[PDB]
Amino acid sequence: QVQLQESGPGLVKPSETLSVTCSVSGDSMNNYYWTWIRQSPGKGLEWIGYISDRESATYNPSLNSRVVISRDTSKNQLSLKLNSVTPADTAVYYCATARRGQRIYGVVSFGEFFYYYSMDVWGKGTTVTVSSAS
Amino acid sequence: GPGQAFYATGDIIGDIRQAHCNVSKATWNETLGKVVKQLRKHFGNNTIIRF
Amino acid sequence: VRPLSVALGETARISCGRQALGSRAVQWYQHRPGQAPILLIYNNQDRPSGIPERFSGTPDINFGTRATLTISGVEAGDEADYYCHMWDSRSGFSWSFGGATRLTVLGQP
Amino acid sequence: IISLWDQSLKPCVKLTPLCVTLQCTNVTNNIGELKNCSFNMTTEL
Amino acid sequence: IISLWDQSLKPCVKLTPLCVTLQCTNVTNGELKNCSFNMTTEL
Numbered sequence: 001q002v003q004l005q006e007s008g009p010g011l012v013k014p015s016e017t018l019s020v021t022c023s024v025s026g027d028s029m030n031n032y033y034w035t036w037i038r039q040s041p042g043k044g045l046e047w048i049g050y051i052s053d054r055e056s057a058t059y060n061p062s063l064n065s066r067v068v069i070s071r072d073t074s075k076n077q078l079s080l081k082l083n084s085v086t087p088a089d090t091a092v093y094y095c096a097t098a099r100r101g102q103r104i105y106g107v108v109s110f111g112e113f114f115y116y117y118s119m120d121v122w123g124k125g126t127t128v129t130v131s132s133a134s
Numbered sequence: 135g136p137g138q139a140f141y142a143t144g145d146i147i148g149d150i151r152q153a154h155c156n157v158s159k160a161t162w163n164e165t166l167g168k169v170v171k172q173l174r175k176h177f178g179n180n181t182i183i184r185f
Numbered sequence: 186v187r188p189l190s191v192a193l194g195e196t197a198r199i200s201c202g203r204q205a206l207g208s209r210a211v212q213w214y215q216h217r218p219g220q221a222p223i224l225l226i227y228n229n230q231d232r233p234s235g236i237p238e239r240f241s242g243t244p245d246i247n248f249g250t251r252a253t254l255t256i257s258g259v260e261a262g263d264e265a266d267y268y269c270h271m272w273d274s275r276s277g278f279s280w281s282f283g284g285a286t287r288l289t290v291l292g293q294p
Numbered sequence: 295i296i297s298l299w300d301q302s303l304k305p306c307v308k309l310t311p312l313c314v315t316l317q318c319t320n321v322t323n324n325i326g327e328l329k330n331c332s333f334n335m336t337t338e339l
Numbered sequence: 340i341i342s343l344w345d346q347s348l349k350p351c352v353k354l355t356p357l358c359v360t361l362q363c364t365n366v367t368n369g370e371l372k373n374c375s376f377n378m379t380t381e382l
């Protein structure tokens with residue numbers, strides 16, 4: 001059971017940093033890849049980006065890269081930091097795996113292929129409110 | 135123009151790819167062996183030849 | 186969003202919005218309202234284990250048919266979100282997951 | 295062969311109006327050899 | 340006859356500039372249309 005526990009403050013004010021973790025258990029952390037996936041009420045699922053073994057966090061052009069994602073191997077958790085929380089950040093934040101799928105339509109010599117990202121196991125998510133309420 | 139039309143290129147349907155020529159490596163190697171043999175016979179008897 | 190009304194039984198066809206510009210590799214998801222979603226069909230033919238046979242993928246013939254999801258004998262468990270995440274080569278990296286469509290089964294005893 | 299090729303090319307369509315300012319872009323959405331060129335051309339009229 | 344017609348049509352005047360938007364109205368009175376249009380002069 002790879003259960004992706006996530007815990008956040010739950011209360012946040014505009015223009016500050018949000019912190020939600022992604023605890024991994026039941027399976028190792030070097031075998032596969034994990035990412036972050038969110039969802040806003042009234043909108044479809046939104047994706048914070050993806051982090052792979054090389055740790056070069058490929059961020060979201062649709063989120064201005066105003067988000068900070070990382071991971072820690074000691075505590076065995078995936079790290080997501082949301083600095084400068086926008087008032088639109090009232091959303092649920094899941095946690096996702098990342099299968100480095102290979103989709104080749106030509107030859108491999110000429111780079112006539114591309115990688116498609118497959119997701120298999122997802123988390124449960126927590127909802128946060130960004131306002132003066134606390 | 136009047137009574138004038140040029141055939142342009144339309145959208146390339148499917149993935150954008152490139153023309154490619156496939157030569158069996160074995161056939162090419164064996165034919166290169168035959169040519170290099172005659173080349174060595176033409177130029178001396180047996181000499182270093184780099185294609 | 187596209188609310189689809191489908192009678193119980195028989196067959197249902199779910200086609201998504203984005204056109205298959207070039208060869209496509211679609212991903213279909215099941216976002217039940219409230220709980221965590223799952224994946225149904227990937228690589229346009231490969232359906233992962235733990236999925237009922239009532240959902241069949243759409244093989245690619247390099248053209249023609251779009252990214253269609255087939256429902257064979259809908260039941261009470263299919264009231265959820267269908268997501269067409271298509272990796273068309275022409276559109277480059279499919280960073281976006283696309284929109285959302287909802288099926289709301291009618292004629293349900 | 296030169297004469298035959300030239301003769302078979304004489305009656306076909308001449309492309310002197312193709313010389314024009316080509317406002318041209320790329321076709322590869324992500325990471326040339328395929329240039330989407332938009333330009334002006336004289337129609338029938 | 341085809342070849343004769345072709346060869347004699349060659350040296351005479353080509354009318355490629357006649358293709359233009361003919362602003363044409365009904366002649367004073369169909370079968371006859373009074374058209375005013377544009378033409379390139381010597382210059």
Ligand SMILES: *[C@@H]1O[C@H](CO)[C@@H](O[C@@H]2O[C@H](CO)[C@@H](O[C@@H]3O[C@H](CO)[C@@H](O)[C@H](O[C@H]4O[C@H](CO)[C@@H](O)[C@H](O)[C@@H]4O)[C@@H]3O)[C@H](O)[C@H]2NC(C)=O)[C@H](O)[C@H]1NC(C)=O
Pocket residue numbers: 104105106107108154155156208209245246247248
């Ligand atoms: C000459 O060049 C090389 C010499 O080794 C080699 O190229 C092959 O070209 C074909 C295309 O003509 C490639 O075909 C693809 O291979 C992948 C492999 O996973 C398939 O997935 C592709 O499937 C197609 O059809 C699917 C269903 O509609 C689509 O979803 C998909 O996008 C594709 O359109 C497709 O078959 C092939 O990979 C290469 N390389 C090899 C090793 O075969 C070939 O010998 C020659 N190529 C020619 C004659 O085009």
Ligand SMILES: *[C@@H]1O[C@H](CO)[C@@H](O[C@@H]2O[C@H](CO)[C@@H](O)[C@H](O)[C@H]2NC(C)=O)[C@H](O)[C@H]1NC(C)=O
Pocket residue numbers: 145146320321330
């Ligand atoms: C090259 O550019 C043209 C013009 O943008 C593309 O054709 C148009 O595409 C739009 C959609 O993006 C259509 O609404 C138009 O009807 C198309 N034609 C015209 C006359 O504008 C064309 O697809 C591009 N080619 C490639 C391969 O990128």
Ligand SMILES: *[C@@H]1O[C@H](CO)[C@@H](O[C@@H]2O[C@H](CO)[C@@H](O)[C@H](O)[C@H]2NC(C)=O)[C@H](O)[C@H]1NC(C)=O
Pocket residue numbers: 315316317332333334
């Ligand atoms: C084709 O002809 C049109 C005629 O209008 C050109 O349009 C103008 O282009 C300039 C830039 O070159 C713009 O500043 C104008 O506003 C355009 N006018 C209109 C009404 O669109 C167009 O540029 C020409 N294209 C080419 C390739 O030369």
Ligand SMILES: *[C@@H]1O[C@H](CO)[C@@H](O[C@@H]2O[C@H](CO)[C@@H](O)[C@H](O)[C@H]2NC(C)=O)[C@H](O)[C@H]1NC(C)=O
Pocket residue numbers: 366367373374
């Ligand atoms: C076709 O139209 C032309 C232009 O209106 C006519 O010629 C002109 O007729 C006016 C009188 O209506 C004269 O004052 C002009 O001098 C004429 N020529 C020019 C250069 O305008 C012409 O007669 C019309 N043909 C018919 C048969 O209707």
Ligand SMILES: *[C@@H]1O[C@H](CO)[C@@H](O[C@@H]2O[C@H](CO)[C@@H](O)[C@H](O)[C@H]2NC(C)=O)[C@H](O)[C@H]1NC(C)=O
Pocket residue numbers: 360361362375376377
């Ligand atoms: C020949 O070319 C002239 C170029 O100006 C055309 O003149 C214009 O015609 C439109 C109607 O088609 C008028 O609204 C403009 O005011 C005209 N401009 C001027 C400066 O006169 C003329 O129409 C063309 N010939 C024909 C018969 O269409």
Ligand SMILES: *[C@@H]1O[C@H](CO)[C@@H](O)[C@H](O)[C@H]1NC(C)=O
Pocket residue numbers: 156157158
């Ligand atoms: C060329 O194509 C034919 C089939 O048309 C095939 O039998 C042959 O092996 C091909 N040759 C190479 C070198 O791929």
Ligand SMILES: *[C@@H]1O[C@H](CO)[C@@H](O)[C@H](O)[C@H]1NC(C)=O
Pocket residue numbers: 319320322326
């Ligand atoms: C696109 O056009 C630019 C010039 O505007 C050119 O330098 C470039 O090579 C073209 N192709 C790509 C892949 O960017």
Ligand SMILES: *[C@@H]1O[C@H](CO)[C@@H](O)[C@H](O)[C@H]1NC(C)=O
Pocket residue numbers: 365369
């Ligand atoms: C005017 O011209 C048109 C051209 O089609 C013709 O049909 C019509 O009979 C003419 N006269 C009138 C009175 O409209």
